[PDB]
Design a protein around this ligand. Structure first.
Ligand SMILES: Nc1ncnc2c1ncn2[C@@H]1O[C@H](COP(=O)(O)OP(=O)(O)OP(O)(O)=S)[C@@H](O)[C@H]1O
Ligand SMILES: Nc1ncnc2c1ncn2[C@@H]1O[C@H](COP(=O)(O)OP(=O)(O)OP(O)(O)=S)[C@@H](O)[C@H]1O
Ligand SMILES: Nc1ncnc2c1ncn2[C@@H]1O[C@H](COP(=O)(O)OP(=O)(O)OP(O)(O)=S)[C@@H](O)[C@H]1O
Ligand SMILES: Nc1ncnc2c1ncn2[C@@H]1O[C@H](COP(=O)(O)OP(=O)(O)O)[C@@H](O)[C@H]1O
Ligand SMILES: [Mg+2]
Ligand SMILES: [Mg+2]
Ligand SMILES: [Mg+2]
Ligand SMILES: [Mg+2]
Lengths: 327, 334, 332, 311, 304, 304
């Protein structure tokens, strides 16, 4: 008890997530508060904890879910359960949850989800892209979210009252991103309850049933990044590549402050972080790989990126001559 | 003779339910009357007793069913049979009730519901969220509700005549809620009764969109759950706070107190579409989160008090065992 | 010979049925005539006798079938083979009739129907709610009717030529009910209900669409139509229910129960055409029986308890005295 | 490591593609750069590499995909997985990818795409003419393109993080051609910046209705219409193919001059591109060779000059 | 090698076509030229041959396809496959063409086209009345023609590079019949029929549909000479098959065969003329035989 | 030789059928003539033999098919094969018509048709309503023509050039009944194909399904003489069917038949007359027997 409490206080989940997620402070704060509430025993054991993650594309929803799963279960693969709801676009596909009835092909195998949950009753379940499921498939989750009960095709009931369920979608993402015009309001010169009652009609229009929505403990809103968070993302990506280069080939990598400013221009609000990822890859790592194959990067050398309308690489001082693949 | 004398004394079922349920007086009365009738004889043994529970979400339908099962069979697990009809969305899934026919996988296993009913013939059967089932699956329930007889894949009848069947659904949720709101508005001029509204409005819904006539004909009683009144919302908030205070005292020896304004602020977060679940989540979010954060060495076994800040109806804080001191900032960004 | 002499005399099937069934006189007459024709041999003895029962819900189809089975076989349970077709909604369900083939799971049990038939060749077989059966099941049924014998999964063939097959459904229930109500209204314009063969021809396409086997319908010996109850038949139903409850009370607790025509009218006012006798049964249970059960634990004692109507609700009178018992108000 | 790196330096992928692909320099450069970045280990292993080929019909998109697959998996047919999204033009066609759920016909079989991917995790997957898919069929591709993960009807999860996905379509063909005119709109007194992709995005979003789908695509490769020189090169390629075929089959030598290439190009059709050129050559020249051969006017070993044989 | 040499050296296809087909000389020549060109190389083997047969119905189109399938697969009936696109007019009928997805109705069947092709990839496929094909079926056929590659619903892929696809329709039958640029004008056995191209364009995705077609074959209405040849061939078939052998040499003179042609039924095609001949040529023979009236045979002489 | 002589003596088959059938002389004569022609080599014996029978239900179609099978086949109608195409649908076509082949859901190879054709290739095969037949089964039935060789669930194919197929329908039932000229004007006191395939071509795609049918047989509404003859035969059966036949007198049997025919068969066929007889006779006799009013020498009773 004492060691767990001391470790949690010393290195909170919220500080652990911040290492991997940039921004999203209100989502981090909500998930951390719920998690901490559960861990300290201040939770009802009858009803499992359920989250729904909403916002635009590529802003860390599945990332946050993965980090939460890793934190809850340090490494156990069975502790984290993935479900790509995009494979459940038809009603009949719900059989994958619980398996076929008696007398039907595949009956001897129980429900896949039932088996997975049985292997780890307190696992973290991620229904990714839940809006891509057929809405009759979501009906199977009514008892799962209310009481953590699920009966396979063989009549065996699974108890998962202590599990944590996370759903992710971008259902209201235009309306959430449009409400980030509150960042543009500049009053000196974050989502309101009444906005959540404008985001509701959209949720019921998609997720047809009020008894489904009334089962979720928390709706988490992920906002579009502000300019500083874009700079942080670019720096994070460059640091990742620098670490990889240093580890693999002992190459030291440096970049001026203006490199991030140049790179952020590739940001696409419709795609989020992955846009920055692709931009950095395309217009830095391509040059890096071309130089490496050309053998212009001796082990232990120092490479610094300089800023033009394009990006140049200096081998500790001289400009590295760009190789010619076409010869 | 003493069992008979107790039964003469055994009239708390309404009390037992009202302990766990707030409001829904009409439903409690109906269920209690039917159960008393069955208990004291005065009931035909040739036909099971069937209820259908209708209303909005999070208003005690499943809760009432579970409480009734517990009362009838005490803690006996075999006495309460649960089925989540959301798993029966396909016609072929009816095989779960009776098992596979001879010469097919799982035939030797036999029906599951048939086995459970054999274990406890007088069990309380709950088909939760029945309107999620494929109508062809409901078709099998005709015989079960009429004569309480079901034949498994092996040809064995179970003869569950004296069981009790409870069905929970929200098919007419929007109509019932709107009608109840209108009736309450009318009563506000100067309470929970609907005479023909059921036949003219509810019945065509139930029949046309989901069922056959013969299926509805076998239901002994239709029970209607209405949305909570404001006082009932206050009662629900008080119930949740009492539950959390009981947990705190029992486990951490912490005494928890609050005020009426706390109840008002909490109920302000109530959402009609979700019923008691909205209040439950609100209480967990705005109070229990602060209690769990204070439990990092700032809570000790004393009279912790919950109060509203100077910002009326905006914020609420914990105060220490000694009321003159508010609890600190919980200091997360160490 | 003694059994034959006793059966036909002093106890015709119609006489017995009228004891349990209210109305449906035409159906009772048809069933009795067909049964007598079969018994005396003035019928196609080369084929089993087949019936189809149609009409709204709660009008005695299953009840009439059960009473007929009891009359044919007295108390012999083996003489009444009951099959609820709602379990045969899938193609492979036919295996239950004959069991699995040799070498398969459960083949040693060659189907329930075959075993029961060989146990009682002349048993009355009821396929309740036949319309729910899968078309392959209906094909097997038609094969059984035409052939007159069935072969189990073990290769044994069982002769059931003398068996009686009864089927119940509600395929044309709405058409039958609305036509019967229209004929009652038309007869009130004369101031009754005998449905003409042209209405049967109108109904026939519905049956042809549902079953899609013109030979299957043709093979049916008799189609029996049950009508929705008239007001007098509803009053009789209410009186029957009240008599049942009164005799139950008298036997169990020596309580005498009385009522008046007004009570019967009030109870029948709760009738619902879509559910038939079930609606009246439930109304009687909730309106009256609930009060009896509530008052039983403390107030009821041997004597004359009479039901009365104050204005619109049913009230009770004290034993042998015109005092209204105080209801044992639950809770407090 | 050193031998493979030296081999790649000696004979890069670009030359191999140029052996067969004509023009499309920008597309070849982009694909080659991405492939080299992958091979040299300078790529994140958490996400597969995804391409989207856009351009008019008959300009080598699927041809480029085939050449790339051959380069990566030259000695493995299993290394190249081909799909044709015309065969997926309705929502329920997703059941081909992962198979039917438990208790349904074909369940025991399992997904086809899952089988193929499991056989060769690092294969090259080609979704030919993806635009013809029902849009809800593309939804199944989200996990594939993001994490290279897919689950069949039996619950088995296929990991293909190192695979390469190529999607070919002509959704913005007309707009791409109009932009390509920019190079041909020059005052001229070859490479387009193509920042106008900001206004190509709406077309894709209209067709592919989900932004998250586009966000998962690493690169958008644009194939431009052939120029006059590229058309001449294509005609020369076709005539070389036919000449070598004649030599190998009937031992006949076949020869021509500029007048033939120009006359064949003059019959070019934009709507078909390389296919137009193929049809033109076949109709105008191959028919004459076949007729002459059937008349036995071509003794074995003889030499033909196409001395501008026209009209 | 000797088998291949004999296959090459055997009778030219046009010989058999002329043997069994009457008229349609232009179509015979075109098909023979295309097949010979393919055999002698001079044709990219990477793409299957695609033929579009135009003209009135019932004038040998299917017969010509059968004979072609006979040339290449004389020893195998499976070498010829038929599909009538009157079966394939609505979106859900795409699943009948190449099979349903797994877990759906008819998945086991696997579709008509693939089910037959997998047995004989190099067969001859006849799509009757492609006009009636639903656009989504037209999309799968054009894909198949372009690539020669198709997947069934069960995931099995089929290579049909060397197959021969023949499409038949009557979209421009009236224009060909009325123009008759060869029949009654040049030969009754280039015309620059430039209206057929726009006519077809109006009915399909001309970019792909007409671009991929390897060849277009025209069928012309029968002429008087062709009709009398067909009647002579029918009467000879009846005469030689006379199993009551001794009545053979029931010779049909000339003018009665001309009167049988005068029962013009070309609207229904050749089989119509067959019925015409059978009516007043076979019924009288059956009546006489049943009556035992005519042992030893007789001239058909004149009747009507 | 004795079997051959017996088969020869079976003719005239028209008398054979009339021994057990009433009316339908035209159809009987047509069938007999077709049989003779095929036997005598005056038919396209290379092609399957197929009739389509048209008219209302219950007018001797099944009765003529069964009598034809009983006579042609030696005895017991072993070579008869009749099926209800109304139960054949997309979910049942292959599983029953071809019969669920190995590897399919179900192992009922043959299913309903080809499981019996394994023994009697020349079967008389009855399809009881093409109006209710599924398009898939109507297409697979196209194999039955040309050469037959319909695929079985076991893979076996039967050459149908010798088989007899009897499709039937009620969709054309009006074409005969509405006129009654084919009955009134057929040498009693209209024309063959008065209208060529009026409804049938539009409904069953004459191009394939009906184009391959060799003959069409009309069925006419029963005449008053035919109806009264049916009544008389049924009454004779009941009279002899009596166990205590001494009580059977049949006094006024002709008058009772006249009363019975009042409920004329104009609804679904002779079964209407059978029900008339059962209602107006059998019930009365059963009631009298129950009342012990039948000692012997008992007359009839004229009701109405
Ligand atoms: N703070 C961040 N926000 C978003 N992405 C981040 C962040 N930090 C790192 N990333 C990375 O950027 C990528 C974003 O992709 P996702 O995690 O899947 O976001 P998403 O919310 O699920 O978008 P969709 O709904 O799948 S389109 C991930 O690969 C992350 O690892
Ligand atoms: N004609 C009747 N006379 C007396 N009691 C009847 C009569 N009909 C029904 N009952 C009673 O009310 C109950 C109704 O059940 P059934 O008669 O079997 O239903 P049904 O008439 O067949 O219509 P379905 O099958 O529900 S659509 C019976 O169990 C009887 O006890
Ligand atoms: N750029 C090219 N250089 C040389 N050959 C080419 C080129 N493009 C196409 N071809 C050839 O022309 C044919 C066209 O094939 P594709 O490459 O597949 O066309 P496509 O662009 O991919 O587009 P679709 O599917 O008609 S939209 C192939 O036969 C190629 O071999
Ligand atoms: N020499 C011939 N020319 C044309 N048709 C012929 C010849 N011999 C037979 N036929 C008949 O022509 C038909 C061939 O197919 P056909 O009907 O003409 O094509 P389609 O129906 O598609 O228009 C067959 O019915 C065949 O009997
Ligand atoms: Mg995601
Ligand atoms: Mg509930
Ligand atoms: Mg019943
Ligand atoms: Mg292509």
């Amino acid at each position: 008890r004492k060691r767990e409490a001391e470790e949690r206080r010393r290195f909170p989940l919220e500080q652990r997530l911040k290492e991997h997620i940039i921004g999203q402070e209100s989502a981090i704060a909500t998930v951390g508060a719920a998690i901490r509430r559960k861990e300290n025993g201040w939770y009802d054991e009858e009803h499992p904890l359920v989250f729904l993650f909403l916002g635009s594309s590529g802003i860390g929803k599945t990332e946050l879910a993965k980090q939460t799963a890793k934190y809850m279960h340090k490494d156990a693969k069975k502790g984290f359960i993935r479900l790509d709801m995009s494979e459940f676009q038809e009603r009949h596909e719900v059989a994958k949850f619980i398996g076929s009835p008696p007398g039907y092909v595949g009956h001897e195998e129980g429900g896949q989800l039932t088996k997975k949950l049985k292997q780890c009753p307190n696992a973290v379940v991620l229904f990714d892209e839940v809006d891509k499921a057929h809405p009759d498939v979501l009906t199977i989750m009514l008892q799962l979210f209310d009481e953590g009960r699920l009966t396979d095709g063989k009549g065996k009931t699974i108890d998962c009252k202590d599990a944590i369920f996370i759903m992710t979608s971008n259902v209201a993402s235009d309306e959430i991103a449009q409400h980030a015009l509150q960042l543009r309001q500049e009053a000196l010169e974050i989502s309101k309850n009444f906005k959540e009652n404008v985001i509701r009609p959209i949720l019921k229009a998609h997720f047809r049933r009020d008894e489904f929505l009334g089962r979720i403990n928390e709706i988490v809103y992920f906002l579009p990044f502000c300019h500083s968070e874009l700079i942080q993302l670019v720096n994070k990506e460059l640091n990742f590549w620098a670490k990889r280069a240093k580890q693999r080939h002992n190459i030291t990598l440096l970049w001026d402050r203006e490199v991030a400013d140049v790179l952020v221009d590739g940001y696409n609000v419709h795609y989020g972080a992955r846009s920055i990822k692709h931009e950095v890859e395309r217009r830095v790592v391509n040059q890096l790989a071309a130089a490496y194959e050309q053998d212009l990067l001796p082990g232990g050398c120092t490479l610094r990126i300089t800023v033009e309308d394009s990006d140049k690489q200096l081998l500790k001082s001289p400009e590295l001559p760009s190789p010619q693949a076409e010869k």
